[PDB]
Amino acid sequence: LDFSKWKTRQPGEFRAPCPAMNSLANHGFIPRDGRNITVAMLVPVLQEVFHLSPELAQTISTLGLFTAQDPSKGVFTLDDLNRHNLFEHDASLSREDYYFHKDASTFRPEVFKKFMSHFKGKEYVTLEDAASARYAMVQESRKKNPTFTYTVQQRITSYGETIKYFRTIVEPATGKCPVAWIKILFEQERLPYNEGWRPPKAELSGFSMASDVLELALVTPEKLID
Amino acid sequence: ALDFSKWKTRQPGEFRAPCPAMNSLANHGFIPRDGRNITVAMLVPVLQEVFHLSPELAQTISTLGLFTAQDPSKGVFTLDDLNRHNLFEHDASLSREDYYFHKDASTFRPEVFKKFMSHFKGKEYVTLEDAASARYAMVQESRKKNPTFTYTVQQRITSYGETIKYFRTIVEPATGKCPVAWIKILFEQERLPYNEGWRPPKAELSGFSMASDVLELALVTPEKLID
Numbered sequence: 411l412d413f414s415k416w417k418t419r420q421p422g423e424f425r426a427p428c429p430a431m432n433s434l435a436n437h438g439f440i441p442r443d444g445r446n447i448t449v450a451m452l453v454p455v456l457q458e459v460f461h462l463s464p465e466l467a468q469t470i471s472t473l474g475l476f477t478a479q480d481p482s483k484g485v486f487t488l489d490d491l492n493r494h495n496l497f498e499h500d501a502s503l504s505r506e507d508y509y510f511h512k513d514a515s516t517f518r519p520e521v522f523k524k525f526m527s528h529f530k531g532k533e534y535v536t537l538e539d540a541a542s543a544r545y546a547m548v549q550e551s552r553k554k555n556p557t558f559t560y561t562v563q564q565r566i567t568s569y570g571e572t573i574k575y576f577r578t579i580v581e582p583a584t585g586k587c588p589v590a591w592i593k594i595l596f597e598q599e600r601l602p603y604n605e606g607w608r609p610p611k612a613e614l615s616g617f618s619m620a621s622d623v624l625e626l627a628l629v630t631p632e633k634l635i636d
Numbered sequence: 637a638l639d640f641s642k643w644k645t646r647q648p649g650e651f652r653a654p655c656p657a658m659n660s661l662a663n664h665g666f667i668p669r670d671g672r673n674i675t676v677a678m679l680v681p682v683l684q685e686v687f688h689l690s691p692e693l694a695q696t697i698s699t700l701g702l703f704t705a706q707d708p709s710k711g712v713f714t715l716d717d718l719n720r721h722n723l724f725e726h727d728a729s730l731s732r733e734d735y736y737f738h739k740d741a742s743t744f745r746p747e748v749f750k751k752f753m754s755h756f757k758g759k760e761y762v763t764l765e766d767a768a769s770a771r772y773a774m775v776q777e778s779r780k781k782n783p784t785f786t787y788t789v790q791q792r793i794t795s796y797g798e799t800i801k802y803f804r805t806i807v808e809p810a811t812g813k814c815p816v817a818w819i820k821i822l823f824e825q826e827r828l829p830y831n832e833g834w835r836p837p838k839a840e841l842s843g844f845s846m847a848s849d850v851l852e853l854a855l856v857t858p859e860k861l862i863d
């Protein structure tokens with residue numbers, strides 16, 4: 411894992427709405443041009459760079475394959491991940507809903523500003539602030555987007571994405587998530603190795619995700635009952 | 637591959653847990669009948685085969701079971717180890733009373749289970765919403781009556797997870813729906829209702845799918861740690 415090979419995205423290179431996957435490509439940990447991705451190649455990378463458990467890595471990578479133009483052929487691209495309402499969903503943290511400009515892939519400073527304002531004056535992301543920030547995007551989409559789609563599938567991916575950054579973009583010494591490293595991940599699509607980040611000591615598993623998603627929901631004022 | 641007709645209820649000397657599924661496995665002889673000499677390596681394929689747990693989820697829960705032994709290094713645990721309060725066993729159970737009251741959070745309590753089952757009165761099937769209400773009712777009873785109520789991050793995920801476990805594994809092959817009558821058999825007899833039509837579930841219960849299910853259960857539970 412040579413983190414010094416990093417280059418920002420170049421013309422012709424496919425990129426996704428994911429800052430993690432986009433960082434892998436920019437680091438050259440997966441093909442830089444965002445093409446020719448297989449589950450077999452991605453899974454070890456996710457385990458080594460982000461310390462996802464084997465099964466969680468296999469699961470998310472396969473959900474990625476399911477966005478391919480032909481998932482039978484076992485190959486997908488970062489552009490496949492941009493397909494609306496397959497994996498990509500409304501109420502994102504740093505991207506606008508597909509509805510508005512038919513581009514839910516391009517990083518949006520004005521969306522990211524809203525998200526980050528939930529951590530203003532803090533060096534670290536707390537569970538409660540991360541809950542508030544994600545749910546604020548749900549409320550905005552619900553009030554602004556007449557096509558808002560937020561089913562069982564989108565709910566877990568949305569909750570899971572907040573857990574993913576909260577658990578993986580952490581200080582080795584503390585396990586805590588610095589606001590400044592989130593900023594680097596989303597804005598630069600660089601893993602903040604230079605700033606002191608390393609692959610997490612703790613494994614992110616399906617079970618640990620389940621606990622974390624529960625804890626997020628218990629500090630979110632979101633209910634489907636009344 | 638598996639013989640479900642070998643079921644016997646608990647016999648003298650045999651250890652049993654506060655878990656109706658682990659007790660059914662033993663009563664069926666799918667793990668050692670006496671509730672002893674359980675290892676992770678033995679239990680994971682049984683959980684995969686009988687309950688369609690994912691390899692990783694099965695490994696994780698089996699290991700949580702193992703860390704209930706006084707010495708996990710021995711690599712072996714028993715259903716009696718599972719009876720140890722606030723290791724895996726926890727307050728606000730659906731069919732057992734809190735350890736506080738009589739130092740017995742292992743023996744099935746008709747009175748507790750009566751209150752659990754009251755949330756499905758008039759219904760053939762368990763819905764996510766009624767399962768959520770039945771579990772939260774136990775949390776509120778424990779918070780109301782037990783001065784030593786313990787409900788930390790660890791108990792919460794296991795409590796939510798156990799409702800999802802019966803809701804997803806004790807289901808009709810035809811519909812994936814959870815029959816009230818089958819929950820009654822599992823809890824009251826500690827028998828998998830094979831005789832009545834139950835079969836290992838078609839759908840796999842994985843860490844990811846559990847995470848979705850626990851999320852959805854929480855979204856229909858009036859439970860928050862914020863107000």
Ligand code: HEC
Pocket residue numbers: 426427428429430431456460462470471472473474475491492497498499500501502503504505514571572574575578
């Ligand atoms: C392994 C570590 C990992 C981390 C950390 C991670 N992801 Fe993503 N991720 C996506 C997609 C697609 C989205 C877009 C969802 C959306 O619309 O917000 C996304 C979104 C996100 C978001 C939210 C972005 C936003 O603007 O809301 C975060 C944070 C994130 N991913 C972090 C496909 C993937 C895939 C697919 C193969 C993998 C593997 C994956 N992601 C792995 C990871």
Ligand code: HEC
Pocket residue numbers: 653654655656657658683687689697698699700701702718719724725726727728729730731732798799801802805
């Ligand atoms: C694989 C299928 C499986 C199912 C279905 C299952 N369990 Fe349990 N389970 C427990 C323990 C300990 C409890 C007691 C928790 C409590 O205090 O309610 C429990 C409780 C439960 C409960 C709630 C009972 C109540 O009175 O609240 C249900 C339902 C349950 N288990 C179902 C250890 C285990 C272990 C340990 C190795 C395994 C594996 C396990 N359980 C696997 C399973």
Ligand SMILES: [Mg+2]
Pocket residue numbers: 427498499500501502505506507514
């Ligand atoms: Mg989106």
Ligand SMILES: [Mg+2]
Pocket residue numbers: 654725726727728729732733734741
């Ligand atoms: Mg208990």
